[PDB]
Design a protein around this ligand. Structure first.
Ligand SMILES: Cc1occc1C(=O)NCc1ccco1
Ligand SMILES: Cc1occc1C(=O)NCc1ccco1
Lengths: 268, 269
């Protein structure tokens, strides 16, 4: 991969692997999400930021401050087939004191057609206390020089799906998968549960009949609290409708919320 | 990737990804295993075989016959770091009617030094009845033309670790991880649990203190029965031993039906 000519975005090509595809012989949404994280990490490295998923500076490191994902929104038009080359372009943009956005565009390398797009919202937090804090001016200036100044949005439309508020699923859920636990492969280099694991957990409570007859078109997922290495999770889903679902991930015992989201599926 | 000049082996380079590394910022053994499977699949594709993990011909497909892994043995000297390039060479060799072997050599692209090696044993089986059958001469001839004729072994030594018999762990196990279940990401394109998932499940019952102070050098794993999509597994481990050795067993959570047995060898960091 490499930064683009203006140095304000980063592009990388990937060849879809055999173990990366589902029963449709095309990349799963979790493979797509891993590739998004990979290109994001390579963009941070290319300009000198930390590569641990927290995109920190020496200044943030001294203050024990980290960037954390608050929301992921992915829309896929065509899932790449095994052996296909997908090119992904990513960029970062500040949204004031509130937080920062990282966007992605996925393209078919051969045709040049846009096959998917994604957006994410990030917030700054002290890694020990977990307390959120507004971005300081001295740390904002550190990363602004790597972002476009004019608005550049993967989802330009005012009040589009990526910004919709997500309600809390009410019991009883129509479907559930309980007792989900992360294993070592689900952890990152810092021993935290990888953000993509929660996408897989959300999807575990979708009936197999939906997965066999439909394709996932949109997934929006809010991240409220981390699942620790020794926690156990329950994945809940209710049909709200194309097929649409409302999702909730909570701790198996006390029912503490860790994630909420919605999915939209298209009949094959 | 590509077949080599003599067309009897296949090589491919991989750049280690951020999500592919563990706490040591080097590739996990499961990432290594996925890369082994990937280069194996690319070698089958390069010469016209099926790419579903069963390496079948049109002849085998008409008979509902498949190749299945009976044993995996991996030895790693140095785990590649994030961003490093690892080159992997693989080849296949028949071992008579018994079964066939697929071997791998991993190298550091920059230095050319051998950083790891692996071997696997495969057997032919009817995919519906799960009954094993000896390889026929007409099936055998189909793939022999893609294998070296002279012996080429990643583990040449006559009485080496890759061929050692593995005993059955006796209860009580020293350590256990209970209620492990596969999710959709653990399945392949045919909806079978991926062979690498069982490696992760074996390792779940190793105490975190061993993982933090030691590095995995060798893993040998026998595959006896497959875990179905709706099955639940128990991972059991007992220390058998500067080095640490363990005996492992994976069994169904309910009746205790064996699915895998293996051994691991760890070296202090
Ligand atoms: C998504 C995000 O939220 C807060 C910071 C970032 C980020 O990615 N920063 C590193 C970087 C590398 C190139 C541009 O920015
Ligand atoms: C491991 C194995 O056991 C039985 C067959 C095979 C195999 O890989 N065959 C396909 C192939 C591609 C190049 C050479 O052979």
């Amino acid at each position: 991969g490499s930064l683009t000519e203006d140095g304000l975005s980063y592009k990388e090509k990937f060849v879809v692997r055999s173990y990366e595809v589902g029963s449709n012989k095309t990349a799963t949404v979790e493979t797509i999400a891993n590739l998004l994280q990979e290109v994001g990490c390579n963009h941070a490295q290319s300009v000198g930021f930390s590569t641990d998923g927290f995109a920190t500076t020496t200044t943030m490191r001294k203050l024990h401050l980290i960037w954390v994902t608050a929301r992921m929104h992915i829309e896929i038009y065509k899932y790449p087939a095994w052996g296909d080359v997908v090119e992904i372009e990513t960029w970062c943009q500040s949204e004031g004191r509130i937080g920062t956005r990282r966007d992605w565009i996925l393209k078919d390398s051969v045709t040049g057609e846009v096959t998917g797009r994604a957006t994410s919202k990030w917030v700054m937090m002290n890694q020990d206390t977990r307390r959120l804090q507004k971005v300081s001016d001295d740390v904002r200036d550190e990363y602004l020089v790597f972002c476009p100044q004019e608005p550049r949005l993967a989802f330009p439309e005012e009040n589009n799906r990526s910004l919709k508020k997500i309600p809390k699923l009410e019991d009883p859920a129509q479907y559930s998968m309980i007792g989900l636990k992360p294993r070592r492969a689900d952890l990152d280099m810092n021993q935290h549960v990888n953000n993509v694991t929660y996408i897989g957990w959300v999807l575990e409570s979708i009936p197999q009949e939906i997965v066999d007859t439909h394709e996932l078109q949109v997934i929006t997922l809010d991240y409220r609290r981390e699942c620790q290495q020794d926690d156990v999770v329950d994945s809940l889903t209710t049909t709200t409708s194309d097929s649409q679902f409302l999702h909730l991930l909570r701790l198996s015992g006390d029912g503490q919320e860790i994630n909420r989201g919605t999915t939209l599926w298209r009949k094959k």
